[PDB]
From a paper:
Here, we show the molecular structure of AORAa, the first bacterial multisubunit AOR, with a global resolution of 3.22 Å. Unexpectedly, our structure reveals that an extended protein filament is formed by AorAB protomers that is nucleated by a single FAD-containing AorC subunit. Our reconstruction allowed the model building of an Aor(AB)2C subcomplex with good geometry and refinement statistics, while the third AorAB protomer of the complex showed too low resolution for full structural assessment. The repeating units are connected through a polyferredoxin chain generated by lined-up ferredoxin-like AorA subunits, essentially forming an electron-conducting “nanowire” decorated with enzymatically active W-cofactor (W-co) containing AorB subunits, reminiscent of another recently characterized polymer-forming redox enzyme, the hydrogen-dependent CO2 reductase (HDCR). FS1 and FS2 mediate the electronic connectivity to the AorB subunits (11.9 Å from FS1 to the FeS cluster FS0 in AorB), and FS4 of the proximal AorA subunits connects to the FAD cofactor in AorC (9.5 Å from FS4). The largest interface in the complex (1662 Å2) is formed between AorC and the proximal AorA, which takes up to 16% of the surface of the latter.
Aldehyde oxidoreductases (AORs) are tungsten enzymes catalyzing the oxidation of many different aldehydes to the corresponding carboxylic acids. In addition to the catalytic W-containing subunit AorB and the FeS cluster containing protein AorA, the protein contains an additional flavin adenine dinucleotide (FAD)–containing subunit (AorC) that enables the enzyme to reduce nicotinamide adenine dinucleotide (NAD+) alternatively to viologen dyes. The enzyme is involved in the anaerobic degradation of phenylalanine, benzyl amine, and benzyl alcohol, not only mainly detoxifying surplus aldehyde intermediates but also taking over large-scale oxidation of these aldehydes in the absence of dedicated dehydrogenases.
Numbering used by the authors:
A (entry chain E): 1 to 424
B (entry chain B), E (entry chain A): 1 to 616
C (entry chain F), D (entry chain C): 1 to 158
């Protein structure tokens, strides 16, 4: 047969490796657009700090790795798809044919429509060229202004603060990390960050950025409240949207993300999708949602490649898991951390210690754990995923978990790994 | 070297916990954990202050082998001046607390003064702080440990605390760590509770470095473990039967007191022995014993785990005692059992649960209960005063008295005074079975003479763990001798006391002496510490420790008049058994002991032995 | 020819003698809080259960790593962390459903059991033989033998 | 319409004709070390007993899988392993209290008795008829009839 | 094809066990397991070498149908130059060891040289290595098997070892695997122990792949098993009674030797037969037989399981022999029984247990004991030399002699020399009942004429398995003949020897020849191996194997002057039974046998017959 894969991130690499392992008598083509070997963008911040070189961001470092597995590497950007007679038209004028297709094109950042946002000193942080420009401009002692206080915004502000410059954060919302933390933990993170020496102004937006007499001096940014800030470099971390630029006039159904079923497959027989572009069913209810994280990309790529080769594999669902390091503080969140309506039988617990920077919260919908959120907990923090993903029927232990929420590993052992080791 | 070179020295009157270096040239003369702590006490306090007051002092200490790879290396000590006796008190406990103290960077803690408000102490590797504990006062040990662990958000914190029997200042309170492991004797809990100190909590993440020779130490420990694995006593007897195996063995010989030293044999001793803990109960068809557990680093695992019946009349209306906790040791089973005449097994476990929950001492409590029951049977105590009938062999009376004494309500307020003071209050001092204020352990001294001599000449009142001559006359592990003879006993007592002092100072369990010897203990200390640790130095250390303890004890006021026994043990012949018609002969062995020890006829060290041991 | 650790939790006494060895070999100091095998105690029933890594075949930790710092050893069949390409991004610690690979802040890296390259030191220091190093296939032969002896009653006393 | 295996250990000679058939039916090569039924010999009493999975209804192996690669069958009432969803995490070999469902390091999955979709191969190769395939209910008819004949002593010679 | 194409070739002098491909073009001319091993031996050694020396060699081999689905396919062989006879020795053993060697990946092991230190071999599928065994020298077979299995932590390892008689170099030692089912006869244990090798341990998980036709082989075996399941002998007789059932039958014909071939009928033969095993003992009311067992893949299961009485004087004070072990075969019961006039079953069981434990041969031991009894009864041997009275019918003497021979102390040393050398030492060579150094099996040659010739012209000594003509003169399964004529006997012997050679070379049990035939063995070999395997090829292979063995034996120094019998058999008439006044008439059959075989009258192959078989 013949398999053609678009995009060479984690998803494409894992899918190609699994396809080569499964069916050793096929042709595999892997495509990309950037002028670099397959690399993770996740390790861009540590390039900014100076811990590693650029070559340390590569996904596979063993020399000549994509030859022993007989995988063909090409270059080109897909611009047109013809699903009726299975044709792909690239930008360079050449053409390719296929038998099975996998779409793993990822996402791209979005810019707010602010006047003067295309000035040379306004950069995003998504690729290697942006990292090079930021490194060129962020000399020690410079002036930096950043937009957004989300997740990637927190990572970038941590990296830039470690680089050793002044920092200012403008957030349009009400608190920091509003999508992965409760307000109390957000307040703790805010006060810790302000103590460490980073100025944060909240509940405000950017009105306009204006240029001075020459492109050697910094810029003048006027906020919504009225005050003006002089800043050499401006970082934009608004948000990201999926890469869908050739599926608009095809019978492939496309919402905000590409829609798939439990075994990854779009609404055409012979086209598959995985990564940041796929919209997959939820674990709790069953709706479609997009989660842009690394374990999701790995698992979806493996399942899609296994189903595409001819076998039959199934996916359980998707889940949002996050871990964050900010200037020496480690925090994490799992699942439906915001709880649920009490009239349907839920319960929760929250333990807080302010002067020592400690927090923990547990939520139970009906005899099963549903979400968790913690600050400073690092040992055996993976067992929460085991308790949430596989819905363990806690039973009596539920009451115990309401009085001391630090015995989740003990409950997991006594309920779903060795239930008969305690029988006497 | 096994020492970590740091002391804490907190000042309970105003806080101010400030570190301080350890004193070398004292470490290589007493070896630590029984001689270093008592030297620190003796060299800076006075022997005349009353037991409970602000002017007193308390020391917590560990040993050089504590928290290392050596077998049974997890023991720690508490040193103070006992309020029950008036002598110097040193209590030893196991568990996982001394190891955690050693992993945190310290190896000694000194408490002095008195705090105006209740507080508790917290240590994290450099950061020791005092915190308000006004919400823990009046709660038992288990709730205190659970509340501290839940508040500080860490399930690996090691906690030591007192109960309600320390706050009320019962004369025989104790310190309990890790639920069922505990110190005891001489009422150290009263001294802890007189300072408004509630609990100590330790968390340690630094490790034990500083060994002069690592591979030699590892090889020595590995070679020494084989000898312990080979002996039948420490390979099949202890792990399978606990210390309860001695019940029938002592009962057959006719050396088991019963009903306040009125008999020398118990008819129901087969009902509370070790075999009764392995039989399937008729109601549920399951034994009381579940498994066994071990202290830190121990490779013998002599502990007990027991489950109480759910249909017994004492706990059938209470659902908070239905779990699994610690079992019965030999002394507790004797004191709650044959000392009163109670043949039930569930009542003993219930009383042990109460004693572990509220922090008391089973031996002193059982002996005092037996004395009170004898007084009631004679006629001095009436029903109206007690509020309850107390005949011999009544389990309900034992349970009721245990509840009243632990909760400190009613006649228990008298019961908590102790057998000596309670007997003196009612004009009958001859009915107290004690020497210098502490009641006798589970061995009778009519059929055995070395135990009588060991009781009469011990440095902290009547204790059987200072000089243990049963191991030569019953088990006979070095040699088998005759327990009916009074020839060659003083040298036995002297050698055993010296060996026990060295073992206690080393920082390891004493039970390993059933298979080890000083030959098997010297190489590990030599490879672990700095200096010349030969055999002569070890013998000199033992003698020096004993002589310095005797000097401190003698300076405080106690003299040769206190080396006596109650008239019942020296004028009442035995009634039945192999030792029928025998009486103790302490008068024929004490002058020989004074002669062979090198002291005066009145029990005072001479300048010759003081100059020989370098005590001047 | 691969082998694995077998854990029998009915024989453990909670002496923590194995954590000392597992920490001394890898750090050089005795420290039962930096070991890679843990022991959990259940007090209401009186049981103790050791806990370590099972060395998965399609392990989540190997696939989740973004910088290729975890690799398989063909001789002994274990996943090993190369602590010179790792950057301490901690994404491998939330993507393990049992939570055995953990984070060490003294050096700023991660750690997990690596079978000591075919020479476990935790199995040599255990006195009660509750940890064994046996072949990967047929790890349940003892239980099969015991239950075959127990269930299949003999044709006697009847 | 459900059926189960009956094992009778009083008619076994230890010829190991079960394991060759069970291994050949699944792997393609004769290999008694990769079968899912095992014969244990107790020499001191002169007894031989074969053992295999009993297909529980409160399955421990079913409820401990984090990916749901084990599910029930309704035709034969047999638990199955779907060997392209399993990831070889080896947790299912710890939860089972009887010792069955084991690992296979050559392919990287686990294995247990699946009743061969209602056509057992081990029950056809036994010459002594010590393994039988009967209906799930009423497995005690053969012993009950013999004991009814024997226990009731006749009214003869009395 | 049934072969795996690999040989080991270990060098005991310096280790270095290095693999090597199998030699095809010899496998399709000898079929393996009795021709391939001896072809290797003949082609790479010299016949003039002494039996035990480093220059000797030892070969372990299996067959093409070893470890497959075919019935009874689990047998292996050991080939060397025997020390008891001086001719070529081939021993056949069953159990579970040959199948495990087949599953490991190899199908032949060659030992050459002598090791300076005691070692043993360990094999896992690609990895063979020699390991020290100095802590195993001087232990029994059971103990070394259990020790290896416990030390390696694997209950699926197969072990083959020797006892104390192998180390002491007793001339009739053997090799035991799986606690019974051993080799024997020509003393291969002495050769194994002279090479300073203790045991072989093997564990295989690779599987027997490579059969040229899977469905054809499966169908052929399924059809072949149906014939074996309908024959009355191999469906009800052998599984229920075993090989012992023959005893009474032979006794009814008056062809059973008794008391060193002095009689032809035993009066107590009904007390050691199979029915005597099926009866209940008055002491306990339970029979001596428990159940039967089977070798690897066998569907007949003619084995035995027995338990010894607990009140017999031999084993009354030794609780080590109270378990359940293998039962009595026919030849062990004859040699320990009727050969000495002993009618006690428990003594026979104890002697067989000792022989199995220490690794000896019951037939040679029993014959040597009988010769010693006759020598004592004559008057040459005095009670002072032996140390005990040795009359006929003494069970106690038999037990003591068994213990002495097993441990090799005192007179047992002399008993370790065999019957022929012992008789020659005292100047009575006429009392040794042996041909070429091997004693006689349990078939008399006066009431049977074919077995006299069969004993006279066998290639390894007095053996009854090379040519078995009792199957026609007693049971008569091919054709019922008359055992009182000598007409048409040479053709019988020739055909039976050729068929037996083919059966042994194939790799299956020979008992299956009671229902099977060459026509039922051809399809399985044809569907398993590759090439042309027809009936003519099988006949040619059998004849070639026999001729090559005879040629090697001739080149070793043995000729036509050793084909004789003791004077007692050919000169002394019978004294009872239906064969009255009959003596052997071997002198009227030997020239016919030489002529029919196509040999020179002096017993050398002619160039015509040598060229016909391609042996030149
Ligand atoms: C803890 C955590 C921290 C993170 N930190 C960061 C961070 O600091 N910065 C960050 O940017 N992300 C960060 N992420 C996000 C994460 O690194 C990626 O968003 C995602 O995991 C990559 O998955 P993917 O392969 O589907 O996307 P991608 O790796 O983006 O895959 C898209 C690939 O396809 C190529 N492509 C694009 N268009 C085409 C086309 N038309 N034809 C062919 N190929 C095409 C692209 O060049 C790219 O190589 C973080 C995630 C987590 C969980
Ligand atoms: S090994 Fe496979 S079947 Fe067993 S629990 Fe893990 S994923 Fe499930
Ligand atoms: S017939 Fe007897 S000796 Fe031959 S293989 Fe079968 S059980 Fe073994
Ligand atoms: Mg204590
Ligand atoms: Mg044989």
């Amino acid at each position: 047969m013949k398999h053609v894969i678009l995009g060479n991130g984690p998803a494409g690499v894992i899918a190609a490796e699994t396809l080569r392992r499964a069916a050793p008598t096929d042709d595999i083509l892997l495509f990309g657009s950037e002028d670099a070997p397959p690399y993770s963008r996740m390790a861009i911040p540590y390039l900014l700090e100076g811990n590693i070189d650029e070559s340390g961001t590569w996904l596979r470092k063993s020399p000549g790795h994509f030859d022993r597995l007989r995988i063909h590497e090409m270059r080109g950007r897909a611009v047109s798809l013809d699903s009726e007679r299975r044709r792909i038209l690239f930008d360079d004028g050449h053409f390719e044919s296929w038998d099975r297709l996998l779409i793993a094109t990822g996402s791209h950042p979005v810019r707010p429509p602010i006047p003067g946002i295309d000035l040379p000193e306004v950069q995003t942080c998504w690729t290697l060229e942006d990292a090079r420009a930021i490194a060129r401009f962020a000399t020690p002692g410079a002036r930096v202004l950043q937009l957004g206080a989300g997740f990637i915004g927190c990572i970038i502000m941590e990296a830039l603060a470690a680089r050793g410059v002044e920092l200012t954060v403008v957030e349009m919302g009400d608190r920091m990390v509003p999508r992965m933390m409760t307000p109390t933990a957000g307040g703790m993170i805010r006060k810790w960050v302000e103590d460490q020496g980073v100025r944060v102004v909240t509940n405000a937006g950017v009105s306009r950025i204006d240029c001075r007499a020459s492109n050697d001096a910094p810029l003048d940014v006027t906020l919504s409240t009225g005050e003006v800030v002089v800043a050499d470099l401006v970082i934009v971390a608004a948000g990201v949207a999926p890469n869908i630029a050739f599926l608009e006039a095809t019978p492939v159904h496309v919402a905000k993300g590409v829609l798939v079923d439990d075994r990854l497959q779009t609404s055409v027989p012979g086209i598959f999708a995985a990564g940041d572009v796929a919209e997959a069913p939820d674990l709790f209810t069953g709706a479609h949602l997009v989660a842009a994280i690394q374990p999701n990309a790995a698992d979806q790529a493996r399942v899609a490649a296994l189903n595409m080769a001819g076998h039959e594999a199934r996916l359980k669902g998707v889940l949002a898991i996050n871990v964050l390091d900010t200037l020496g503080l480690i925090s994490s969140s799992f699942g439906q951390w915001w709880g649920e309506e009490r009239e349907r039988g839920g319960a929760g617990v929250e333990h807080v210690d302010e002067a020592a920077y400690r927090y923990l919260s547990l939520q139970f919908k009906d005899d099963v754990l549903i979400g968790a959120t913690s600050i400073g907990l690092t040992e055996h923090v993976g067992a929460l995923r085991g308790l949430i993903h596989g819905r363990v029927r806690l039973g009596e232990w539920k009451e115990r978990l309401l009085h001391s929420p630090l015995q989740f590993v003990d409950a997991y052992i006594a309920r779903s790994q060795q239930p008969m080791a305690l029988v006497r | 070297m096994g020492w970590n070179r740091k002391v804490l020295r907190v000042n309970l009157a105003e806080g101010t916990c400030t570190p301080e270096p350890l004193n070398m040239q004292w470490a290589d003369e007493y070896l630590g954990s029984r001689g270093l702590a008592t030297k620190y006490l003796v060299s800076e306090t006075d022997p005349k202050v009353d037991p409970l007051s602000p002017d007193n002092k308390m020391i917590m200490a560990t040993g050089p082998l504590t928290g290392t790879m050596a077998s049974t290396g997890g023991r720690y000590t508490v040193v103070t001046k006992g309020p029950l006796t008036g002598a110097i008190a040193c209590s030893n406990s196991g568990g996982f607390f001394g190891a955690e103290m050693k992993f945190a960077g310290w190896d000694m803690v000194i408490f002095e003064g008195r705090s105006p408000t209740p507080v508790y102490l917290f240590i994290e590797n450099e950061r020791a702080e005092l915190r308000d504990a006004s919400y823990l006062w009046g709660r038992s040990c288990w709730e205190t440990e659970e509340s501290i662990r839940a508040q500080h958000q860490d399930p690996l914190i090691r906690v030591s605390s007192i109960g309600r029997a320390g706050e009320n200042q019962v004369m025989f309170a104790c310190i309990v760590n890790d639920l069922h492991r505990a110190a005891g004797r001489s009422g150290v809990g009263a001294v802890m509770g007189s300072k408004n100190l509630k609990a100590v909590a330790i968390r340690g993440t630094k490790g034990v470095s500083g060994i002069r020779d690592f591979p030699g130490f590892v090889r020595a420990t590995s070679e020494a473990k084989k000898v312990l694995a080979g002996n039948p006593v420490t390979s099949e007897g202890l792990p399978k039967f606990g210390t309860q195996v001695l019940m029938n063995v002592i009962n057959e010989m006719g050396a088991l007191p019963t009903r306040n030293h009125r008999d020398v044999q118990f008819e129901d001793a087969s009902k509370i022995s070790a075999e009764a803990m392995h039989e399937k109960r008729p109601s549920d068809g399951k034994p009381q014993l579940v498994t066994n557990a071990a202290c830190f680093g121990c490779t013998i695992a002599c502990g007990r785990i027991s489950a109480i019946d759910k249909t017994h009349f004492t706990v059938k209306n209470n659902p908070k005692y239905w779990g699994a906790s610690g079992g019965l040791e030999y002394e507790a089973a004797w004191a709650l059992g044959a000392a009163n005449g109670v043949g039930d097994l569930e009542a003993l476990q219930y009383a042990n649960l109460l004693c572990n929950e509220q922090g008391m001492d089973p031996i002193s409590f059982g002996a005092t209960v037996g004395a009170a029951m004898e007084l009631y049977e004679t006629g001095v105590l009436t029903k109206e005063r007690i509020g309850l009938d107390a005949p011999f062999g009544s389990a309900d009376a034992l349970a009721k008295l245990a509840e009243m004494t632990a909760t400190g309500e009613g006649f228990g307020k008298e019961i908590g005074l102790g057998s000596k003071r309670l007997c003196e209050k009612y004009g009958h001092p001859e009915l107290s079975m004690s020497v210098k204020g502490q009641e006798f352990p589970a061995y009778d001294s009519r059929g055995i003479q070395g135990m009588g001599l060991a009781y009469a000449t011990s440095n902290r009142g009547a204790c059987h763990l200072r000089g243990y001559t049963v191991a030569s006359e019953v088990l006979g592990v070095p040699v088998k001798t005759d327990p009916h003879v009074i020839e060659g006993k003083a040298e036995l007592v002297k050698a055993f006391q010296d060996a026990t002092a060295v073992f206690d100072s080393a920082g390891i369990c004493v039970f390993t002496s059933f298979a080890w010897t000083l030959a098997d203990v010297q190489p590990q200390i030599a490879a672990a510490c700095d200096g010349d640790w030969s055999m002569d130095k070890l013998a000199t250390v033992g003698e020096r420790i004993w002589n310095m303890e005797r000097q401190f004890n003698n300076a405080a006021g106690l003299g040769a008049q206190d080396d006596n026994l109650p008239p019942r043990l020296t004028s009442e012949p035995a009634k039945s058994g192999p030792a029928k018609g025998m009486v103790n002969r302490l008068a024929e062995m004490l002058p020989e002991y004074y002669g062979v020890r090198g002291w005066t006829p009145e029990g005072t060290p001479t300048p010759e032995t003081l100059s020989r041991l370098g005590l001047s | 020819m691969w082998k694995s650790l077998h854990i029998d939790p009915a024989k453990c006494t909670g002496c923590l003698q194995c954590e000392m060895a597992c920490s001394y070999e890898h750090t050089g100091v005795i420290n039962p809080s930096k070991s890679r095998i843990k022991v959990f105690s259940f007090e209401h029933e009186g049981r103790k259960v050791p806990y370590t890594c099972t060395q998965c075949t399609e392990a989540w930790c190997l696939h989740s790593c973004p910088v290729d710092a975890i690799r398989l050893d063909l001789t002994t069949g274990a996943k090993m962390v190369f602590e010179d390409t790792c950057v301490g991004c901690k994404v491998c610690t939330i993507a393990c459903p049992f939570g055995t690979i953990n984070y060490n802040q003294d050096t700023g890296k991660v750690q997990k059991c690596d079978l000591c390259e075919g020479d476990p030191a935790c199995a040599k220091a255990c006195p009660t033989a509750a940890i064994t190093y046996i072949d990967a296939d047929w790890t349940g032969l003892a239980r099969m033998q015991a239950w075959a002896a127990k269930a299949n009653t003999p044709a006697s006393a009847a």
